[PDB]
Amino acid sequence: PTVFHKRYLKKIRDLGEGHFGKVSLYCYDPTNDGTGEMVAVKALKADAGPQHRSGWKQEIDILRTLYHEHIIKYKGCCLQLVMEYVPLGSLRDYLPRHSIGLAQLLLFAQQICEGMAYLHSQHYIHRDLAARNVLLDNDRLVKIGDFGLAKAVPEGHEYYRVREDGDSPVFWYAPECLKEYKFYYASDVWSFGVTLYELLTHCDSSQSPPTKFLELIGIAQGQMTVLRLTELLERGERLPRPDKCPAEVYHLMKNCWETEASFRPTFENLIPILKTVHEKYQG
Numbered sequence: 001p002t003v004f005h006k007r008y009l010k011k012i013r014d015l016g017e018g019h020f021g022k023v024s025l026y027c028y029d030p031t032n033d034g035t036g037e038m039v040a041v042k043a044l045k046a047d048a049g050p051q052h053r054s055g056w057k058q059e060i061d062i063l064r065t066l067y068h069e070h071i072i073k074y075k076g077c078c079l080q081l082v083m084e085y086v087p088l089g090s091l092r093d094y095l096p097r098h099s100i101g102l103a104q105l106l107l108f109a110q111q112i113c114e115g116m117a118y119l120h121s122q123h124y125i126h127r128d129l130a131a132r133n134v135l136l137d138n139d140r141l142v143k144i145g146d147f148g149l150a151k152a153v154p155e156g157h158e159y160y161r162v163r164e165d166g167d168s169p170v171f172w173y174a175p176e177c178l179k180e181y182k183f184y185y186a187s188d189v190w191s192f193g194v195t196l197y198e199l200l201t202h203c204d205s206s207q208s209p210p211t212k213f214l215e216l217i218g219i220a221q222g223q224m225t226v227l228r229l230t231e232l233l234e235r236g237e238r239l240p241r242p243d244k245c246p247a248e249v250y251h252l253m254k255n256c257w258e259t260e261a262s263f264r265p266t267f268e269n270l271i272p273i274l275k276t277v278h279e280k281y282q283g
């Protein structure tokens with residue numbers, strides 16, 4: 001509802017970009033003095049089609065109505081999406097550069113669950129839960145930073161019917177997404193399991209989910225990369241145990257990766273469990 005005037009928005013640097021989105025850092029200086037507040041501004045790339053353009057207002061309305069300590073703060077519009085600047089950036093860019101302890105990773109893991117549990121309680125599915133969409137406020141504060149794929153689950157259904165795209169993050173997806181094209185709340189849990197794997201590997205590119213699943217599938221599979229991913233997943237093949245990752249944390253990852261969606265923990269279930277595991281490694 002807040003209206004930011006384009007003239008006061010002074011671009012500083014580009015922060016990140018997706019297939020049809022771009023996020024840039026701006027100083028909103030109506031004067032020109034030190035008061036100039038730092039804002040993150042998200043806009044639609046020129047190439048975006050009318051499907052992604054129509055679902056952009058819907059994105060803006062999702063973040064508009066989400067108020068949670070582990071969800072990026074919405075500021076207003078100028079359409080361009082004005083949000084808070086989350087100082088240390090994505091975990092994907094941060095972790096390969098800063099060696100963070102196991103205890104802190106488990107703490108970040110917990111906060112992702114609280115934001116995710118809150119999101120699910122508002123009847124929304126994220127569909128893009130990955131380390132790149134989790135922003136670092138400080139060494140003890142994390143936030144879900146992008147909702148480009150987020151969708152409301154229709155009232156009388158337990159899943160959203162997904163429209164098989166090219167920009168879909170298939171290496172973060174559960175088999176029911178890849179095979180039946182249904183996105184359950186339990187499908188975000190599968191992705192959290194992947195995100196936890198990313199945190200535990202410090203977002204190292206050589207150990208990333210696409211790197212690991214392609215070493216298994218092969219890089220010359222024609223139109224069959226998704227199909228071969230589905231069959232290895234249904235054969236019970238999973239990402240390896242991140243080196244130094246606790247055995248119990250791995251079993252919790254593996255349990256987020258149950259082939260049967262119903263056998264997976266909810267985000268609510270995960271919070272008491274991660275709080276305990278964190279407390280354990282905090283000592």
Ligand SMILES: Cn1cc(-c2cn3nccc3c(-c3cnn(C4(CC#N)CN(CC(F)(F)F)C4)c3)n2)cn1
Pocket residue numbers: 015016017018019020021022023040042043083084085086087088089090132133134135144145146148
């Ligand atoms: C020191 N330092 C701070 C930052 C910083 C701060 N903020 N504050 C808000 C957003 C960001 C980001 C940022 C970087 N990538 N992203 C995305 C994924 C997500 N969250 C959005 N995606 C782009 C599109 F699709 F939305 F357009 C990528 C966001 N980076 C980077 N280095």
